[PDB]
C-alpha cells in the first residue's frame, strides 16, 4: 500500500505528480542533469524521500548509468535531462538500449507547449529525433495524463522485448496543479493483445524430439536468456547440451563450466564456431542472428536443424529461417522442456559423450591464447588476474575494442549481469558510466570498469561523478596509446597504414599521453600505474583492497590482436588464428 | 442550452457520444455511407431525430456534397465513411477541400484498436494516408476523447484558415459505453496561441496612406472575402478601386458592378490583368497568388505596392514579396479601414477616376468575346441565358474544364456562395454531388450544376441520390464529346493531336455519346436535349419550371476555346485573345 506525500484531494504540480509516479513504480534512483526546462521536475526530486538522483557530469553519462543500473539488477534505469541541448546528450544512450534490449525510461523537459514547433529556447523535437531509436516515445500534452503514460511507459520499457522509452514534458505541464487518477487503465489494447502467451506443449514436445534424434546439438545462448540462469543449468543438466554463448549472453551459463564452449562469433573461441559449423541441432535461445555471430548467413550453421525461441515475433526468420519456432519467454519453454526431460528420462536416455569428445579435441588444439612478451604486461593476462583475485563475481563493465574482446574472453563470469558491455551499438564510453550505474545498484558489489584509453577519455568528466558519490568503482585500464580495434584492421586489411589511431602525443611520441592518473588526481580518486608484468598482480590486488574509487593505468604493448578473428561476412574456414602487429 | 436524449448519468455506446457531440456542434446533415466498421455510427444516427443522413452512392460523392453544403452555407460540411474502401474513397475530397480552404469534418470508422497494424479486414491507416492532406487529423484511441476531439475537429476546421479534419474512431470505442463529459478544454495551446489577433491601427492607417497616394489602385480579391461582402462593398464605395477577383472569390464583389474588372489570371479578362499589370498599388485581400492568377510571379504586378492581408502567416510572402503585410481576417481589416476613410474622407479627396477611366478603355476593347456558327449552341451564350433566366440568384456548381471557365466568365454573380468550384486540385465530378449538397442546405434556392460530359460521368451515380432525397436540382450540361480542356491544349501546343480526350464512340462518331437522357431515365430524373440555339432558352426555361430534378443535354461545338489565355509561366505580353480548334 502506497503511502503518497499529498492528500487524495489535494492539487499538486504535475513535476510532484511525475515523481510520485515514479515512486509507485518502485524507482529508488535516478540520474538527472537539470536545466530550465526540467527544474520544476528536479524541485520536486528534492521533496521525494525514497528517490535519489546521481548527478552525472554529461547526460550521456547520465543515460550510460542507467544503462549500467538496469543491465546489473534487471530493473529499469531512468534518466532525466532538460530540453534541447540535455536531450539530444540521450540519444548515444537510447540508440544503444533500444540495439541490447535494456529497460529504460528517459525523462526530458521540453518548452511550453504553445512554444512547442516555433524555434524556441532550447527547444529539439526529440520525439520525432528519438522515434527510430526507442521502443517507443510520448509527448504529454496534459498534466492528467502523467500517471498513465509514466505507468506505460515503465511497461513497455520492461515487458516483451526490453527497450527505451522516452517521456517528454512540456514545462508548463510540470507547473500545472492537479488531482492525480492512480487508477487510469493503460492505452495499449493492441501491444497488450499481441504479447506471447505460454509456450504450448505441442511445441515444447517437438524440441525434445528433436534432441533424442541428434547427435551434434549445440547450445546457441544470448542476451534474452539473462533471467533464465537456473533454468537454462537445469536444462543442461538433463541434456548433456554444449553451450555457447554470445556476447550479450555471457555468464547465463558458468564460464569456467566443463560444458562451456565460451563466445561464438568474429572473436569467438575456435571450438564455440566449430561446434556450430558441424552441428546438426542448433538450440537458438534468446539470440538475434547477428551478423558478429553468424558471419555469411549460408554458412552458419549450414548442416543444423534451427530451434529459435525468441519473444519477439519479428526477430524468428528475420535473418536465418528455422525449422522450429516458438514466440514466447525462453525462461517458460525452458521450464516447460525440463519438466519434459525429467519424466521421460529413462525413455530418452540422452547421451552426446561423443559429440562432447569431439569438441573437447578441438577445445585442447585451439584454447586461447597469448604471447608474453620480456616484461611487458599482456593485457589478457591483466585480466586473467582480476578474475583470479576477485574469484570471477565482481560485476565487469568494458567500453569497445580490443579491451572489451578480451574482457569477454579472458573473465570467466559465473551469473548473468555481471557482464555489462555495449554490443550492439557498440558506443565507447560506456564503460565508465555503467560502473557508476551498476554500483548504485549493487552497492556491496565489486565493480570494475575494464575500459580502453579511447573509451575511457570521452566520457572521463565522469570520474568528478564517482568521488562526489563515493561509489567503490575500480577502473582497470588497458592502455595500449591507440585506437585498437582499428588499429588491428588497419595492419590486417590496410598494410598497417595509420589513419588516425594513434592516441598519445607524436611530439613525445614515447610517453603515455594523457597521463590518465592526473584526471583521477583531479577528481580525488587514488590512482597508480604498472608496466611490469612482475608488478601487475600486487597493482591489481591494491586496487581492489584501497576502499573506495581506484584507477589502475596498465600499459600494455599495442601490436596485440583480438585472435581468433572470423572476418567481416566470412565463414569458419576463414578464421585467423594467428598473427599481430609486429 | 443543449437537450440529450441520454441521462446525464447514463452510459450510452461511443457511436451515441459522437452523434450527440455533432448534434452539440449544430449538425443537421450528414452525408454517411454505411460498411462494417461504421454499422453502430449508423445506428445511433437513427437515433437522432435532429441530424438527418443524405446517403450517396460513392463516398466520393458523400465527401463532395459535404464540401458543396459548405461553400455554400459557410457551415462545415459533415461525412461519414467506413474503413478501408470506404476510407480512401473519401481522399479526393479531403485534398479538395484542402486545397480550397473548405470546412470539412470527416468521419470514419476503424478496426478495432488491437487490430490495428495487423492488415486486418479492410484496415487502412488513413491517418497516414490523409496527414499531408487534411488541417489535421486525429485517431481516437479512447471513448473518453470523443467529446473533446469532435470539439477540436470542429474548431479546427471552421477557425483560422477553414480545412478538413478527419476522425478515425475503431469500432470497438464506438461499442464501449461510457458517460461523456462534455466540458472538457481543448487541447490547441500552440494553434489557439497563434491565431491571429485584431488588426491594429497602426499597419490599418499606412494602407489607407498607401491609397492616397496611389493613382492605379487595384483590388485582387479571392476566397478568403467570402464572408466580407458587405464589407468589401462598402470599402468599394469609400475609395473606389477597381475590383478583380479570383475563381475562388467571385461573387464576393457584385460581377454585374460598374467597378468589377471580374476575373483575373490564365483565363481572366484582358481588362483585369491589365489592371493588375500596370497598377501601382496592388491590394491583395484573401489572395494566395497562386500560379494559375500571378504567371509568371517576376512579371506579375511588376511594378505595384503590394498590400496582403491573409489569415494565415504562411501564405504572406509564400510566392510574392509583399511591401506591407496584415495578417488577420480580412473581414476586420475592411472594418477597421472603413472607419478610417470614412471619417477622412473629405481630408483624403480619393478619385481614381482617371485610373478607371483607362480600365473602362480596355474594357471595351476587349471584352469577352463568342462567335456563334450558325444554330449550333455557344457554351457561353447557354450560360448567359441561364444568368437570365434566373436572374443571376442561382447556385451554380461546376465540374472541371472548359464549362467550368464559361460558367466563371459568363454568369454575375451577386453574392458569394453562388459559386461552387474546385480551383486548387480542380477535380473533376464535383459538380454534381457539390450541387446535392449545395441544395440540402439551401432547399429554397435554384441550384444548377453547369457540368461537363467528362466530369458529369464520373459521379454520375450521385443522380440516384438526387431522385431518392427528392432535392430540385437542375443540370446544365455543357456537351461538347470531349476532355474539352485537354482537348484545347493538344490544338494549342500539340497541333491539335489528339491522345485520348474524345469521349463518345469512334464506331458511331457522330452520334451524342453516352445517352445522358437516359442516366437520367434509369433515376426517374426527367431529362431533355437541346442542339439547335433557337431552341435553347425555352429549353432552359422548362428545365427551371418543371419542379425537382432535371437534366438538361446540351450539344456544343467542340472547337470552341476558352479566351483569353495566358499560357502557364507567361506574362501579361503572351495573352492569347483569338482562335480554336477550327
Ligand atoms: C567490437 C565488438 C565485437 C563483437 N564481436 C562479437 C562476437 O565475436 N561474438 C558475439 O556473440 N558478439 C559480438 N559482438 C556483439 C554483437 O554485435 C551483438 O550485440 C551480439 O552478438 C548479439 O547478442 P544476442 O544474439 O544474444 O541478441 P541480443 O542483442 O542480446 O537480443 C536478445 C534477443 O533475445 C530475445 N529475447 C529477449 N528476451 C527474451 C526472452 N525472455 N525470451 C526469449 N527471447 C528473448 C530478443 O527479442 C532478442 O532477439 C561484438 C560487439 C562489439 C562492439
Ligand atoms: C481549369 C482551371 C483554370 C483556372 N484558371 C484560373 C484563372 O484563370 N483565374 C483564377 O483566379 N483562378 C483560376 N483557377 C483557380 C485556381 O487554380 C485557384 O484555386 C485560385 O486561383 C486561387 O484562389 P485564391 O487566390 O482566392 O486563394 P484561396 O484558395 O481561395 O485561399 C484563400 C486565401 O485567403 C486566405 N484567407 C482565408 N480566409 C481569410 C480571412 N477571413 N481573412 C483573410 N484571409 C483569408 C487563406 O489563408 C488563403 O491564402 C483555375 C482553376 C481550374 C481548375
Ligand atoms: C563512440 C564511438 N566512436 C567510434 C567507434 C569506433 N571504434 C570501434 C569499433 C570496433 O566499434 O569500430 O566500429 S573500437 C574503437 C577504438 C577503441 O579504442 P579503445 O578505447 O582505446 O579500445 P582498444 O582496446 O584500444 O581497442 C573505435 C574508434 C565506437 N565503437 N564508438
Ligand atoms: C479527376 C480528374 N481527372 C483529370 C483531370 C484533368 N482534366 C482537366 C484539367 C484542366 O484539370 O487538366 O489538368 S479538365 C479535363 C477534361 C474536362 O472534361 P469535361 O468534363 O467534359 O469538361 P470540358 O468542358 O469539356 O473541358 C481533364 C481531363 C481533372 N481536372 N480531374
Ligand atoms: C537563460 O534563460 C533561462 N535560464 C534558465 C536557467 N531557465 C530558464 N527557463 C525558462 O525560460 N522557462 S520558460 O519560460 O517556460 C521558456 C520559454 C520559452 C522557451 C523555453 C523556455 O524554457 C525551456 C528552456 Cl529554458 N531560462
Ligand atoms: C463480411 O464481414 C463483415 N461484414 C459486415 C457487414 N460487417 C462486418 N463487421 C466486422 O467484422 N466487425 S469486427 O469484428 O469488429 C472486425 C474484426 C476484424 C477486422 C475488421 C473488423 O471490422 C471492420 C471491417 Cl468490417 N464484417
Ligand atoms: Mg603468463
Ligand atoms: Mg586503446
Ligand atoms: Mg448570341
Ligand atoms: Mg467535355
Redesign the pocket.
Known amino acids: 500500500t502506497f503511502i503518497s506525500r499529498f492528500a487524495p484531494d489535494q492539487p499538486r504540480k504535475g513535476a510532484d505528480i511525475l515523481v510520485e509516479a515514479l515512486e509507485r513504480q518502485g524507482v529508488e534512483t535516478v540520474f538527472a542533469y537539470p536545466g530550465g526546462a526540467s527544474m520544476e521536475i528536479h524541485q520536486a526530486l528534492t521533496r521525494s524521500s525514497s528517490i535519489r538522483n546521481v548527478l552525472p557530469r554529461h547526460e550521456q553519462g547520465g543515460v550510460f548509468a542507467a544503462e549500467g543500473y538496469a543491465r546489473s539488477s534487471g530493473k529499469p534505469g531512468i534518466c532525466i535531462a532538460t530540453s534541447g541541448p540535455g536531450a539530444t546528450n540521450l540519444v548515444?544512450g537510447l540508440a544503444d538500449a533500444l540495439l541490447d534490449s535494456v529497460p529504460l525510461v528517459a525523462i526530458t523537459g521540453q518548452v511550453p507547449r504553445r512554444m512547442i514547433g516555433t524555434d524556441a529556447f532550447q527547444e529539439t523535437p526529440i520525439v520525432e529525433v528519438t522515434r527510430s531509436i526507442t521502443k517507443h516515445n510520448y509527448l504529454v500534452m496534459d498534466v492528467e495524463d502523467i500517471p498513465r503514460i509514466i505507468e506505460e511507459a515503465f511497461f513497455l520499457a520492461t515487458s516483451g522485448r526490453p527497450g527505451p522509452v522516452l517521456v517528454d514534458v512540456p514545462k508548463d505541464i510540470q507547473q500545472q496543479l492537479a488531482i492525480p487518477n492512480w487508477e487510469q487503465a493503460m492505452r495499449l489494447p493492441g501491444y497488450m493483445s499481441r504479447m506471447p502467451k505460454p509456450p504450448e506443449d505441442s511445441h515444447l514436445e517437438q524440441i525434445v524430439r528433436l534432441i533424442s534424434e541428434s547427435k551434434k546439438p549445440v547450445l546457441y545462448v544470448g542476451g534474452g536468456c539473462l533471467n533464465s540462469s537456473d533454468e537454462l543449468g537445469r536444462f543442461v543438466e538433463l541434456t548433456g547440451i554444449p553451450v555457447a554463448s554470445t556476447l550479450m549472453g555471457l555468464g547465463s551459463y558458468p564460464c569456467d563450466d566443463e560444458l562451456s564452449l565460451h563466445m561464438l562469433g568474429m572473436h569467438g573461441t575456435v571450438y564455440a564456431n566449430y561446434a556450430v559449423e558441424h552441428s546438426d541441432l542448433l538450440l537458438a535461445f534468446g539470440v538475434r542472428f547477428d551478423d558478429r555471430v553468424t558471419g555469411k548467413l549460408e554458412a552458419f550453421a549450414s548442416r543444423a536443424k534451427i530451434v529459435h525461441i525468441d519473444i519477439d515475433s519479428a526477430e524468428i526468420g528475420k535473418n536465418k529461417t528455422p525449422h522450429v519456432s516458438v514466440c514466447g519467454d525462453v525462461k517458460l519453454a525452458l521450464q516447460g522442456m525440463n519438466k519434459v526431460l525429467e519424466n521421460r528420462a529413462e525413455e530418452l536416455k540422452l547421451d552426446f559423450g561423443v559429440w562432447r569428445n569431439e569438441l573437447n579435441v578441438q577445445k585442447q588444439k585451439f584454447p586461447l591464447s597469448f604471447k608474453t612478451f620480456g616484461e611487458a604486461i599482456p593485457?589478457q593476462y591483466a585480466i586473467k588476474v582480476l578474475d583470479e583475485l576477485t574469484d570471477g563475481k565482481a560485476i565487469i563493465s568494458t567500453?569497445?575494442?580490443?579491451?572489451?574482446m578480451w574482457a569477454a574472453q579472458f573473465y570467466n563470469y559465473k551469473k548473468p549481469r555481471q557482464w555489462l558491455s555495449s554490443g550492439g551499438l557498440?558506443?565507447?564510453?560506456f564503460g565508465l558510466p555503467a560502473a557508476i550505474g551498476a554500483s548504485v545498484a549493487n552497492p556491496d558489489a565489486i565493480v570494475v570498469d575494464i575500459?580502453?584509453?579511447?573509451?575511457?577519455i570521452?566520457n572521463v568528466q565522469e570520474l568528478a561523478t564517482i568521488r562526489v558519490e563515493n561509489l567503490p568503482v575500480k577502473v582497470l585500464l588497458?592502455n595500449?596509446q591507440?585506437?585498437?580495434?582499428?588499429?588491428?584492421w588497419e595492419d590486417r586489411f590496410y598494410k598497417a597504414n595509420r589513419a588516425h589511431?594513434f592516441?598519445g602525443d607524436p611530439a613525445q611520441e614515447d610517453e603515455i599521453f594523457p597521463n590518465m592518473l592526473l584526471f583521477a588526481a583531479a577528481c580525488g580518486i587514488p590512482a597508480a600505474r604498472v608496466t611490469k608484468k612482475a608488478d601487475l598482480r600486487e597493482a591489481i590486488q591494491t586496487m581492489l583492497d584501497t576502499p573506495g574509487p581506484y584507477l589502475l593505468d596498465v600499459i600494455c604493448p599495442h601490436q596485440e590482436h583480438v585472435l581468433p578473428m572470423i572476418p567481416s561476412g566470412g565463414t569458419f574456414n576463414d578464421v585467423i588464428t594467428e598473427g599481430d602487429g609486429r
Do not use: I, K, R
Open positions: 548515444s593485457p567500453g569497445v575494442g580490443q579491451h572489451q557498440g558506443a565507447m564510453g575500459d580502453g584509453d579511447g573509451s575511457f570521452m588497458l595500449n591507440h585506437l585498437g580495434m582499428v588499429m588491428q589511431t592516441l
